Amino acid sequence: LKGPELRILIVHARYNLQAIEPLVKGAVETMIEKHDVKLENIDIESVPGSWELPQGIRASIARNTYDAVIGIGVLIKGSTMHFEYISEAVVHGLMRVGLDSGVPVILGLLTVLNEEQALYRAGLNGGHNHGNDWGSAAVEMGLKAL
Amino acid sequence: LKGPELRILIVHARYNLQAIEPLVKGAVETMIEKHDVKLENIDIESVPGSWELPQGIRASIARNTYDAVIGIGVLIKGSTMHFEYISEAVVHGLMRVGLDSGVPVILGLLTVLNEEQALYRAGLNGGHNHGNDWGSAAVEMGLKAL
Amino acid sequence: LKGPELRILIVHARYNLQAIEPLVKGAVETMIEKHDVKLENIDIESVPGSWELPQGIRASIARNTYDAVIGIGVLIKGSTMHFEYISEAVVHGLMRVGLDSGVPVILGLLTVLNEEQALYRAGLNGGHNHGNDWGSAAVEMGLKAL
Amino acid sequence: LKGPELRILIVHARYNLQAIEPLVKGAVETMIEKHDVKLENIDIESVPGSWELPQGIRASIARNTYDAVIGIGVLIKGSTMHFEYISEAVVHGLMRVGLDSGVPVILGLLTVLNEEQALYRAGLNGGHNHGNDWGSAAVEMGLKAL
Amino acid sequence: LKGPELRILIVHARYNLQAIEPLVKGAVETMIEKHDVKLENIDIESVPGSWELPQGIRASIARNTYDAVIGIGVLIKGSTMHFEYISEAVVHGLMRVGLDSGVPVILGLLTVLNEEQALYRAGLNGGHNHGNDWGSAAVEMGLKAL
Ligand SMILES: O=Nc1c(NC[C@H](O)[C@H](O)[C@H](O)CO)[nH]c(=O)[nH]c1=O
């Protein structure tokens, strides 16, 4: 599946940047190299934390036109219930924004127990980079939308 | 109950295809063989993962007209909280799409602890294929809708 | 409280019929015998499972006019997380349908760990039939709605 | 803070009346004695159970005009998952009704493990009556609304 | 990032004031000192408890115009399930208000097991004041909104 005409938006948070960067890279590279997406057609915005993800995406969806958007963030369990509540709220938020707008929203949210799990799913320490999968999913949903 | 005039949509994810195929088959066969649904009147779309299910269904519901739709996906517990949050979000999502559109959405989502449980509910290893039940449910809700 | 003019709708699922029948009976009998509701004024629809409850109710609410509706279903914990997710989604769904329509929706949903608990709350094995309470609640909310 | 002109609505369920009455009293008395709210300006409706709370409040909010409303109910953990699902649904429902209507809805819902805990929070057995706090909150939000 | 023209709203609850004051201070000081936000351009409202947070914010969002709002509250686990249900409802409520209005809502909600954890995240006893981070997040989201 190739989408030379696809316009993709990527909004990522900045918490746990060590895990986030590889994820964004994987997503971008895969779209470009495996799906012929054009670098100029990929916008990359960022927000402070995962909580801002739904809101950041919604604001951008109103500004420009995209065929698909990927929300990327990394939530790690802490000592409080903060993680549980934010996670639940962000996941529902992302789903709402996609259903409300009609624009496919790909879930690049990692909700892990600790750092190691995040890094692993970002392709480090022998793991598989999940951003790659998200890249392909974005392309696919973008096309099926047209 | 027979629905020769019913138009049914089936959207399934592609994760855990070993479990998904039998489910789709069961659903289709049952509708055709037990309810006189016409093969030509059954559309089968697919999406990457369960997360795309609500969005895929919504997009299609807008394109064409269906009497009922079946969302099929298989979520398996992993090492992180990913499973819990995606499950909760997809289930609420599917319910929303059905209530928003007025089109009956049948739940063919399996949320299991491991592969064996999925395969079992797909009719393998002595289990009962749940896709069959979903097929009948779709037909029934489609008729009651008219 | 008597509601001779009340029009009540009862939508019940068909899973765990052993527990469902007594519940419907209790609800109907109580409304008729204790509240003077007229048998002709009580519609009884059914759907495959609890998941279809919100959707079934919504469809009917659009067709005819009712003063109150009772959603009856029985969900039993199985081996997977299926029970937890369906339960949460159905409960939110029923609440939405009632708030969206302005029509009182009485919760006749049992979310139990096993069969015995269901049967018991259906008035068998020394238990109290909860359908009765639901019957009275429906009548009361219907009147307060007018 | 005094609100002589405030019109307050109180909707309470009837389950666990032993705990509910003290709560309503505390709320009413505090508003009157500490905030100069007029007895004639306080409406008190009731519903069967906590599930009817959101619906009861919504119906009344449409009938008359209020500056604030207090939802009072007592949910006690039983042997099934009933408590968990009803609790979650009612809390979300009350929040929705307030955000939808723009009318402040004060949470006078107790979600406890057993009777003792309820009675205690109702001011009995050495406890502090929480209805009092709700009374003050209602007055405060009602004023800030104007 | 500097926002001399930004208008920021801060709504905080009054429960656990020992933890709330430092949080508000941190937020305000950071915006002013690190982002050139003007003291006159920062409104600070308050509400009784965290439950009133979404409602308070919504009311204010309707009155005036803000570029971003920060919701600050502290919920501590008690002996009942009260904490769990209020937390879930408030977090979803805040997300809704931001998505509904299009105005960025920063989450300054602490959901902790005990006081010590709250104080610690408020910058006391060797901890880092989280209000600071919230201040920067507000400024950032406010600008990206314009
Ligand atoms: O706290 N842990 C995390 C976190 N908190 C930041 C929050 O999303 C937000 O920026 C403000 O709290 C309120 O606006 N954000 C993440 O993306 N991952 C975490 O693991």
Ligand SMILES: O=Nc1c(NC[C@H](O)[C@H](O)[C@H](O)CO)[nH]c(=O)[nH]c1=O
């Ligand atoms: O991860 N496990 C699973 C899964 N992840 C895929 C996800 O739904 C989606 O494709 C992207 O994450 C975000 O768009 N999807 C499933 O259907 N089952 C699983 O068991």
Ligand SMILES: O=Nc1c(NC[C@H](O)[C@H](O)[C@H](O)CO)[nH]c(=O)[nH]c1=O
């Ligand atoms: O599975 N257990 C149960 C159940 N599944 C059926 C489901 O509601 C529905 O019919 C289809 O899954 C998707 O449309 N329905 C119940 O009322 N109780 C249960 O205990």
Ligand SMILES: O=Nc1c(NC[C@H](O)[C@H](O)[C@H](O)CO)[nH]c(=O)[nH]c1=O
């Ligand atoms: O069951 N326990 C409780 C309860 N059930 C009643 C329910 O709210 C309703 O009246 C009907 O079920 C469906 O309409 N209601 C409460 O306020 N507290 C409880 O502790």
Ligand SMILES: O=Nc1c(NC[C@H](O)[C@H](O)[C@H](O)CO)[nH]c(=O)[nH]c1=O
């Ligand atoms: O109870 N514990 C807490 C609490 N209850 C107050 C509640 O938010 C509200 O004021 C009324 O209950 C209903 O309107 N509020 C908090 O901000 N933190 C807590 O730790």
